[PDB]
């Protein structure tokens, strides 16, 4: 059919991915922005074929406005369409050290958010397997607006099956289980929350060695701790909510659906501490800036190999 | 500019500051807003970005980017143009399926309209390069654009050294001499810049950059075979006339679009595909991509070490 060359305008191009391109696109009718994913299916070798279809069934499935939303799917002659919420806040950590002030209230509403896009994506059978900074988006560039968690390309529909899935995640998020080939489901995302969590209330991570080896011994062990002085002024609620997360057997962590009951999350505007917190934004700065470096020496060693043949 | 517009898109990055979409409240109309950091600027920095802003607002031309507004708030500046999304004209050229000289004079046409605008109105470029030659859109018969007059000086009819500004590989002999110089060094630019258009590669090349400036001021590039036999001599006058070691002796902007292969293209310039040209520019393309790269992590460097201090 051509449901999407007659139903939407074509914009700008905004990236590309391993096998598409992105372009801005307007919706006639409704008038509604949207980020839409190009991509040729007869050019597709299978195996990105098979990727594309898993990719656009769990996308379809997760309908939730903490979630980068796809909005269709629809596939014309050779090309597919897949038309996305077009979200343009950025970084949330990076919006964070731009903020006046930030206190625990502040991380509570954020983490608030991230667990309700999580137990929605586990109340549907879905275990996303790649929370990290990158991932964790604002809607626009507006005060207030949402959290949006970003790139189900890892996610897998575990539903209630048990078996070890495979490496895959970020180092620094990973989870004991994962680490350990023990199988693995839903706990994971809760595991990665809690390293997020910290991060969100002193700016560094739990989970910190320059040895890969050390750094998964130092997961799988639960080995984090809570530093002075910095974490003096840390509420114990934050601190126990926390150690819910970050605890090594998946069979004792606490699920999304119970950390969004706790008071320290329902009831911020009492329970958790409204003092700034100027180190954190200190930290968190040279935390994103350690990343950005990273990412360019990554950009650097893929641009030499393109040159290179 | 808070009140006025609101952000939306990232359409590119550089030093200190953020390319993004952006649209005018009131109208509805959509822009290119450059968000430049100037927190760290000095006085003499910020007489430098009103040079800039001066220059663009005096420069309204269909083949240069227009400056709708300039405005300085808190701690950032914000440089509104129009909304260029085309990309950098030598990306768009390699992804062709036929590129021939006729091809190279249209956008060798545009630029030198966009320089004989400039130089009329006695300001000189001084950075005419790849990356800041880009596309009205992706659309077919998208105009070439002349960008970033960062460097552009109001020189009118005096006579001086204005210093090593610009890239090496662009770089006049006059500016290298330390003689005076003006208006022509954008030519002499033009000229290396054809010369890539045509083959896909540098006329001026070296691993130190000592043998690279001694081959510049001396003039010193060939056409090489087997590749330059299927130019026109036309083609190759017309660089010739551009490489001019000598100021005086260079062609004007004015007097090269009456030369007949840009003024009369469809008959003069070859229409054969140059399937080498664009392979070359490929490598070429992508050696500046790592450069590019390269910088980017230089950047990201400065930026953790200037938070540690």
Not at 150 to 161: R, W
Request: aromatic share 10%; hydrophobic share 40%; charged share 25%.
């Amino acid at each position: 059919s051509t449901k999407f060359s007659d139903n939407y305008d074509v914009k700008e191009e905004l990236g590309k991915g391993a096998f598409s391109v992105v372009r801005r696109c307007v919706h006639k009718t409704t008038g509604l922005e949207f980020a839409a994913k190009i991509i040729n299916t007869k050019k597709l070798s299978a195996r990105d074929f098979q990727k594309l279809e898993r990719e656009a069934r769990i996308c379809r499935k997760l309908q939730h406005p903490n979630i980068v939303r796809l909005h269709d799917s629809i596939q014309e002659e050779s090309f597919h369409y897949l038309v996305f919420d077009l979200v343009t806040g950025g970084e949330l950590f990076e919006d964070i050290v731009a903020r006046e002030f930030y206190s625990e209230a502040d991380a509570s509403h954020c983490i608030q958010q991230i667990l309700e896009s999580i137990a929605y994506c586990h109340s549907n059978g879905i275990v996303h397997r790649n929370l990290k900074p990158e991932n964790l988006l604002l809607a626009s560039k507006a005060k207030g607006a949402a959290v949006k968690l970003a790139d189900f390309g890892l996610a897998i529909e575990v539903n209630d099956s048990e078996a070890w899935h495979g490496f895959a995640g970020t180092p620094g998020y990973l989870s004991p289980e994962v680490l350990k080939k023990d199988p693995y489901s839903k706990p994971v995302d809760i595991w990665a929350c809690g390293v997020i969590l910290y991060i969100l209330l002193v700016g560094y991570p739990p989970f910190w060695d320059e040895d890969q080896h050390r750094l998964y011994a130092q997961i799988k062990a639960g080995a984090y701790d809570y530093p002075s002085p910095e974490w003096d002024t840390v509420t114990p609620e934050a601190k126990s909510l926390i150690d819910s997360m970050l605890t090594v057997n998946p069979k004792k962590r606490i699920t999304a659906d119970q950390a969004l009951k706790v008071p320290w999350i329902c009831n911020r505007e009492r329970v958790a501490s409204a003092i700034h917190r100027q180190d954190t934004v200190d930290c968190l700065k040279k935390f994103n800036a350690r990343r950005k470096l990273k990412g360019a020496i990554l950009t650097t060693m893929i641009a030499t190999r393109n040159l290179s043949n």
